[PDB]
Amino acid sequence: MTEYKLVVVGAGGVGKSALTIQLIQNHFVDEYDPTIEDSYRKQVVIDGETCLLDILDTAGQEEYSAMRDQYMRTGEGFLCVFAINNTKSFEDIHQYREQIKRVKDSDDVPMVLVGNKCDLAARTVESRQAQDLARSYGIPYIETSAKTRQGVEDAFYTLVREIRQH
Amino acid sequence: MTEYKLVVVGAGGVGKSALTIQLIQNHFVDEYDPTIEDSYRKQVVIDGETCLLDILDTAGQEEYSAMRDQYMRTGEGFLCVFAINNTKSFEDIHQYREQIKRVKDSDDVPMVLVGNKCDLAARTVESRQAQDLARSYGIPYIETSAKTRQGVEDAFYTLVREIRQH
Ligand SMILES: Nc1nc2c(ncn2[C@@H]2O[C@H](COP(=O)(O)OP(=O)(O)CP(=O)(O)O)[C@@H](O)[C@H]2O)c(=O)[nH]1
Ligand SMILES: Nc1nc2c(ncn2[C@@H]2O[C@H](COP(=O)(O)OP(=O)(O)CP(=O)(O)O)[C@@H](O)[C@H]2O)c(=O)[nH]1
Ligand SMILES: [Mg+2]
Ligand SMILES: [Mg+2]
C-alpha cells in the first residue's frame, strides 16, 4: 500500500508529541516527557485510499542540528508546529523551513504550518501573522488543539493531500 | 469581517443540500426535496480568523444552464460534488468545471472535488479514479458523508483555505 512518511518538527514544548498521540492513540498527554525520536505507524483510510502513515516525532532540542538532516532527507511531508502562546516558537519556524529546503534541494516541499494550543486564551501570536507567513511560504496554515482534538485530523490529512499533489 | 462566498454544485441527488445542512444545522436530511436556490450565512472561526461563510446551495437540474453563469461569476470557491455510487454524477463533474472556468475566465479557480455518500457500500466510482481526476485539475479530492458527518468540515474548510491561497 501507499505509505506516507510524515515528520513533525518544531521547537521544544509546542506539542509535537501530544498532536501525534492524539492522532494515533486518541488521548491528550499532559506530562513532561521530552522526545529523543519516536516512530508511529498506522494503517488508515484517507479519502477512500487505504494507506500507511509512518510518522516521525522529533526532539525540539538543538543537540545534533545536523542529525535533523537525516530525517529531513527521508521525510515526504512536514508538519511545522509552533504554539500560539509562544512567540519564540513562531520565530523558530523560519529556521526549520530553511533547513528542510536546504537538505531536500527544494523550494516547495509538502508542508503545513500548524499553530497549536489554540484552546489557550493567553495568545501571543495573532492568526493573521501566521496566515501571512504561511501565504509567503505558499503552504496551508491550520490551528490545532491536542487538548480538545480540534484540527488534529485536519492538519495530518491536509499534509497527506499536499503530498498527493506534489 | 472577511466573507467567503462558497458555491455547492453537482448533479441532481448527490447530496449538495445534505452536506450544507450538516455543516450549518448539524443534522442529516433524509427526504426528497429538490433545491431551486438556497442561501446560508454563518459566522465561524476558521484557523483563528473570524469569518462569514456565505454558502449558495444550487439546483442539480438543467433548466437555465445559463442561469448558473450568474452564480458562477460571483462565487469565490466551489465544492464540486458527485456521489460515489453514481457514475453519471462523476462524469458530469467535467461539465461543471468547464462551465466555471469559462465564466470566470480562469484555469485555476478555488475548487474541491468532493466524493459524497462514502458511507454507502455499493460503490461504483473508485477513489483512485477520482484522485486521478482531481490531480489533473490540480485540486484536492475529499470524500464525505453527510449521513455520518465524515469529512464535511474538512471539505468546506479546505475550500476556504484554497481561497486564502489564491
Ligand atoms: N493546552 C494545551 N496544551 C498542550 C497542547 N499540546 C500540547 N500541550 C502541552 O504542552 C506540553 C508539551 O507537550 P509535548 O507534546 O510534550 O511537546 P513537545 O513539543 O512534543 C516537547 P519535546 O520537543 O521536548 O519533544 C505538555 O504539557 C502538553 O500537554 C495543546 O494543544 N494545548
Ligand atoms: N447515505 C447517504 N445518503 C446521502 C448523503 N448525502 C445525501 N444523501 C441522500 O441523498 C438524497 C439526496 O440528497 P439532497 O441533499 O437532497 O441532494 P441534492 O444533491 O441536494 C438534490 P437537488 O440537486 O435536487 O438539489 C437524500 O435522500 C439524502 O438523504 C450521504 O452522504 N450518504
Ligand atoms: Mg515530544
Ligand atoms: Mg439540493
From Swiss-Prot, chains A, B:
Modified-residue entries (S-nitrosocysteine), positions: 118
Effect on the protein of changing residue 144 to I: GTP-binding activity reduced by factor of 25
InterPro entries, per the entry: P-loop_NTPase, Small_GTP-bd, Small_GTPase, Small_GTPase_Ras-type
Localization in the cell: Cell membrane; Golgi apparatus; Golgi apparatus membrane
UniProt xrefs under Pfam families: Ras
Mechanisms controlling activity: Alternates between an inactive form bound to GDP and an active form bound to GTP. Activated by a guanine nucleotide-exchange factor (GEF) and inactivated by a GTPase-activating protein (GAP).
Keywords: Acetylation, Cell membrane, Cytoplasm, Disease variant, Glycoprotein, Golgi apparatus, GTP-binding, Hydrolase, Isopeptide bond, Lipoprotein, Membrane, Methylation, Nucleotide-binding, Nucleus, Palmitate, Prenylation, Proto-oncogene, S-nitrosylation, Ubl conjugation
Positions bearing N-acetylmethionine: 1
Effect of mutating residue 38 to N: No effect on interaction with PLCE1
Membrane-topology annotation of the record: Lipid-anchor
Consequence of substituting residue 12 to D: In CSTLO; severe mutation
Effector region, short sequence motif: residues: 32-40
Gene Ontology CC, one term: Golgi apparatus
Molecular function per GO: G protein activity; GDP binding; GTP binding; GTPase activity; phospholipase C activator activity; protein-membrane adaptor activity
N-acetylthreonine found at: 2
Tissue expression as described in the entry: Widely expressed.
Effect of residue 61 to V: Strongly increased transformation of cultured cell lines
Coarse class of the protein's main subcellular location: membrane
Effect of residue 12 to S: In CSTLO and CMEMS; also found in patients with oral squamous cell carcinoma
Class of this enzyme: hydrolase
UniProt record, GO biological process: adipose tissue development; animal organ morphogenesis; cell surface receptor signaling pathway; cellular response to gamma radiation; cellular senescence; chemotaxis; defense response to protozoan; endocytosis
Reactions mediated catalytically: GTP + H2O = GDP + phosphate + H(+)
Subunit relationships: In its GTP-bound form interacts with PLCE1. Interacts with TBC1D10C. Interacts with RGL3. Interacts with HSPD1. Found in a complex with at least BRAF, HRAS, MAP2K1, MAPK3 and RGS14. Interacts (active GTP-bound form) with RGS14 (via RBD 1 domain). Forms a signaling complex with RASGRP1 and DGKZ. Interacts with RASSF5. Interacts with PDE6D. Interacts with IKZF3. Interacts with RACK1. Interacts with PIK3CG; the interaction is required for membrane recruitment and beta-gamma G protein dimer-dependent activation of the PI3K gamma complex PIK3CG:PIK3R6. Interacts with RAPGEF2.
Family (UniProt): Belongs to the small GTPase superfamily. Ras family.
Record's disease association: Costello syndrome: A rare condition characterized by prenatally increased growth, postnatal growth deficiency, intellectual disability, distinctive facial appearance, cardiovascular abnormalities (typically pulmonic stenosis, hypertrophic cardiomyopathy and/or atrial tachycardia), tumor predisposition, skin and musculoskeletal abnormalities.
Name of the molecule in the record: GTPase HRas
Organism, as annotated: Homo sapiens (Human)
